[PDB]
Amino acid sequence: ADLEDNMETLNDNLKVIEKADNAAQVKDALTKMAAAAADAWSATPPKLEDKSPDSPEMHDFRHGFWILIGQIHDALHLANEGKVKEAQAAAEQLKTTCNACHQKYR
Amino acid sequence: ADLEDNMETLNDNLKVIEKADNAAQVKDALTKMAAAAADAWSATPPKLEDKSPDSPEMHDFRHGFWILIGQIHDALHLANEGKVKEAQAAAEQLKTTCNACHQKYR
Numbered sequence: 001a002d003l004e005d006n007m008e009t010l011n012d013n014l015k016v017i018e019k020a021d022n023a024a025q026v027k028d029a030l031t032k033m034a035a036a037a038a039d040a041w042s043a044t045p046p047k048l049e050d051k052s053p054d055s056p057e058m059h060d061f062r063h064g065f066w067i068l069i070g071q072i073h074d075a076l077h078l079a080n081e082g083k084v085k086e087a088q089a090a091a092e093q094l095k096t097t098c099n100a101c102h103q104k105y106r
Numbered sequence: 107a108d109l110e111d112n113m114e115t116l117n118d119n120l121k122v123i124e125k126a127d128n129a130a131q132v133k134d135a136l137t138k139m140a141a142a143a144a145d146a147w148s149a150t151p152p153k154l155e156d157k158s159p160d161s162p163e164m165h166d167f168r169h170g171f172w173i174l175i176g177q178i179h180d181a182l183h184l185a186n187e188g189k190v191k192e193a194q195a196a197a198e199q200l201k202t203t204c205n206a207c208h209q210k211y212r
């Protein structure tokens with residue numbers, strides 16, 4: 001999928017997690033988030049189209065997804081273990097990663 | 107996929123990395139490893155079929171995959187950044203995670 005589709009998937013599923021009741025709902029949403037972030041990892045955003053794949057900006061951009069995917073994975077681990085509230089807390093904190101990349105590159 | 111299929115994917119792609127020449131080869135192999143490890147995360151192995159999903163053994167088993175996925179992810183980052191030799195060194199070291207789980211549960 002393209003960047004915008006992956007980002008909508010990320011956003012929709014974050015909302016699902018916030019209001020989820022059980023571990024199955026949270027696990028599913030984070031699983032979809034992991035796939036969407038992985039798909040987006042390789043993408044070149046509009047604001048960086050004129051930059052080289054090896055530019056400081058693109059290294060920074062890809063590093064943001066590496067951070068995000070690690071956070072999603074750790075949240076998913078908690079969901080796997082039935083730790084609903086704590087996974088929801090992890091999902092809340094990773095918004096900082098969403099925000100930080102948007103700040104620079106959206 | 108079942109455990110055996112995911113493990114074959116894990117094994118075959120590790121061999122690919124070992125003898126890879128460029129970053130594209132390593133990135134592709136690690137991407138496939140990530141998917142296979144994620145798919146195997148929820149699996150109940152033959153030796154643990156009589157155990158509860160909340161048993162100490164299944165907690166230990168799932169934790170091994172959490173570790174492996176994080177290691178694959180970190181290697182994949184290196185591969186994405188064109189760091190071939192260093193990604194290959196990362197793939198070498200995670201064999202310890204493969205071996206440790208097999209030691210107990212294979």
Ligand code: HEM
Pocket residue numbers: 003004005006007008010011014045046061062063064065068094095097098099101102105106
């Ligand atoms: C789970 C965390 C994140 C959420 C919930 C999120 C959400 C969104 C949303 C709702 C949009 C609006 C565009 C659309 O989807 O139609 C967007 C755009 C964008 N996001 Fe994210 N985002 C997240 C993380 C990230 C990260 C980590 C990066 C970079 C490493 C990133 C880079 C971008 C860029 C460059 C755009 C603008 C795309 C365009 O204008 O075509 N996002 N994001």
Ligand code: HEM
Pocket residue numbers: 109110113114116117120151152167168169170171174200201203204205207208211212
């Ligand atoms: C990159 C690391 C790994 C590699 C290369 C690897 C490789 C393999 C291979 C080749 C097999 C034999 C499959 C077959 O042909 O029947 C196997 C089996 C198995 N592995 Fe792994 N493995 C890895 C990681 C892990 C981890 C981390 C765990 C535990 C958390 C694990 C648990 C098992 C189990 C339970 C079996 C037996 C499956 C069955 O009998 O159905 N493996 N592995």
